[PDB]
From Swiss-Prot, chain D:
Contains two binding sites for ADP-ribose, one in the N-terminal part of the channel and the other in the C-terminal nudix hydrolase domain. Both sites seem to have a role in channel opening, but the interaction of ADP-ribose with the N-terminal site is absolutely required for channel activation. The modification Phosphothreonine is found at residue 66. The chain holds residues 675 to 749 of 1503 of the full protein. This is Transient receptor potential cation channel subfamily M member 2. Highly expressed in brain and peripheral blood cells, such as neutrophils. Also detected in bone marrow, spleen, heart, liver and lung. Isoform 2 is found in neutrophil granulocytes. Belongs to the transient receptor (TC 1.A.4) family. LTrpC subfamily. TRPM2 sub-subfamily. Homotetramer. Isoform 1 can interact with isoform 3. This interaction decreases Ca(2+) influx through isoform 1 and suppresses susceptibility to oxidative stress-induced cell death. It is found in: Cell membrane; Perikaryon; Cell projection; Cytoplasmic vesicle. The lineage of its organism: Eukaryota, Metazoa, Chordata, Craniata, Vertebrata. It comes from the Eukaryota. Phosphorylation of TRPM2 at Thr-66 by protein kinase C (PKC) counteracts the effect of cytosolic Ca(2+) and elevates the temperature threshold.
Amino acid sequence: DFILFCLRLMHIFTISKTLGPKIIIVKRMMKDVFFFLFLLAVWVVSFGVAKQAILIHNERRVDWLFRGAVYHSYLTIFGFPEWLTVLLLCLYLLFTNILLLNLLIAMFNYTF
Amino acid sequence: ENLDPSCLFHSKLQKVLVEDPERPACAPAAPRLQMHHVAQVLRELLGDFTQPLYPRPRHHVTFTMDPIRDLLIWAIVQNRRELAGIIWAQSQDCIAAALACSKILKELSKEEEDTDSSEEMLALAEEYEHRAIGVFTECYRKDEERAQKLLTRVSEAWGKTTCLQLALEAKDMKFVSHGGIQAFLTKVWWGQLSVDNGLWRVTLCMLAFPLLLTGLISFREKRLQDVGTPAARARAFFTAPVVVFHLNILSYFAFLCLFAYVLMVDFQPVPSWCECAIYLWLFSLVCEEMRQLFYDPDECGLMKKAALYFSDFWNKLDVGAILLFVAGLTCRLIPATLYPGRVILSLDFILFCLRLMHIFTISKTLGPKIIIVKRMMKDVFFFLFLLAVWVVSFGVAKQAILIHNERRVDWLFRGAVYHSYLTIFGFPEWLTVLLLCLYLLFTNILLLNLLIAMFNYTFQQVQEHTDQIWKFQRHDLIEEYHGRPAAPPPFILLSHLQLFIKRVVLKTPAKRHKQLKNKLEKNEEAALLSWEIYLKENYLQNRQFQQKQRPEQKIEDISNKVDAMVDLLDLD
Amino acid sequence: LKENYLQNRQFQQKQRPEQKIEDISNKVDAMVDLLDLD
Amino acid sequence: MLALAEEYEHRAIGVFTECYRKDEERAQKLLTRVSEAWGKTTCLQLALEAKDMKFVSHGGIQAFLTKVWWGQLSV
Ligand SMILES: [Ca+2]
């Protein structure tokens, strides 16, 4: 409820001349923000499940390996195994560093 | 017989005359022009889906049915513009006629092997699709319902095809991008129930069985809405294709969760039960796609239907995932290759989860963005080659200067590769500052502006008509889920078995449904055609009045009056 | 083909609207001179 | 003088696009030929040395460059 109260302070910027239309713009942008973030979430879950399947055997560990792989996927999302590691990192680079970012740039520029 | 010789249609007719064997059966030197030769060369132009127009005799004056059709085709095929513009105004059912002329002119303009007449033919075809749009928008603004009824009807005059199929096969963007036909597609997509309920209401009625028996959601055709026959209401609710779409999405989601669970924990060398349920569901999916291939509503080419199936993107992706799963099971059955079978099934899980991106095509705002990304990937790839050779260049240069020659296999090589990866992901004082500032100047600036420029550039073009492409794309999704049975992929075997045992012994092969195509009665069709004739006569007057109101025409009229006046004053 | 091109060029230059306005103006000036001569 | 030169490159583009729309092959043959009247130079070399963007940006001459670039085999 403190978060809800502090959200109410954004109403102050409506009275000023230059600031209000930007708030009205953000109120429109949130709609396709949400439906993008679903697409991003299912994508990162897909690569997390694929990596934890290939590079770790089947183990019934409850909170150790699960939170470890989840923290690995979180660190990836926030930003002879030589050929295999280079292939996995370059595939994650090619997908994540490029495609959905241009999707966001295109959609946000379009609605703006 | 007196068609002019220089045109393309005369050349194709003179070929198909001598390709007939029945004339060397009679006499080789004498050519006899028959009507079914013209019908054959017209069937080659119009498409395979239509039946021949002029029949062959299997044996005073005599009229064929609808002679204005024949005169319009004879004026169209040899690019006489002003004759066609005159005798189109006399035509019976003009909506189908304009689109058929547009299809004929596009197909005849493709094979021209010239330059002037090809552009003339394309301009004429575009003009005729404008005529069809004008007459249909008059019929739409007057009455909402009969204008919808005018689309799905079969037309005897043009070889038993509907108007919508001609508009699709001729690839007319501006006709199907009209508001009324899009409203028709939405009306078919929402099915039996009313179109104003919203998505969350259908979601809650899908989750809750007794909520449909209440006063919730909506209906149209209020004989079912008022009187309570909940068996019929439930059959109508589960018949609708939106419901079948959400059921397939939910079943696919549960299938993916079970596949991820068995891949993460239950990959066993002994054959497993949670695996065999998934093999059952995947056999269900492949039998569904085989049924989707074998559907032939009209008589058509099997190889042509195969090219039509494999032309589509998601069919290629679906059959690739099926083939990879077939390979993965044979890799799983051999005990020596169990872990390669595991990694193959993981890559196939990636392929299955890529299929969930298809859901966003149906929504209004989201689909054009997918069409934009499908264009952007092409120069994405050729950029990433340039980025890779660049980072390899600085990695090799740095590892050459700051490390001596050592034959270490995996230690120093993976160390330098991890250093280059950490660089890519984001008195040695002067040298280190120089190396870091050089990597800063190159990496933090140049290729980033290359990406910004190229991506902005291609977005500025594809953004313009992604919407017009998507409105044309919208049809086949609705047609497929109209054709698909209602059961989710667990029970679609129970749906498939009755159809398969029925088709073999005594049934029809395939028949279209009476929502997309139907044959009207004569008593209704006469009044409908008279209504359309009267609205065409209404449209032509507004067109000629608007063309008279143009300013350049007023200037030309004043000039002609002034020339008449100076001639009159010269005569005095 | 050059002789073919020149005719299309001069016909397109004749079809311009400002040239039509100038032609109407010259005809009207000829007419007012003729009515002044009577 | 600059306006007159731009007008004359428009004249050259118009006559060449007529020759191109009528026949595809002889229009290609018209470029590479040597001209005795203007000191034994070809037309393409004059269009390059005069720096005319709109002449070499035409579709037919670009098709000629593609045709030379693909060489003996089909394009
Ligand atoms: Ca399919």
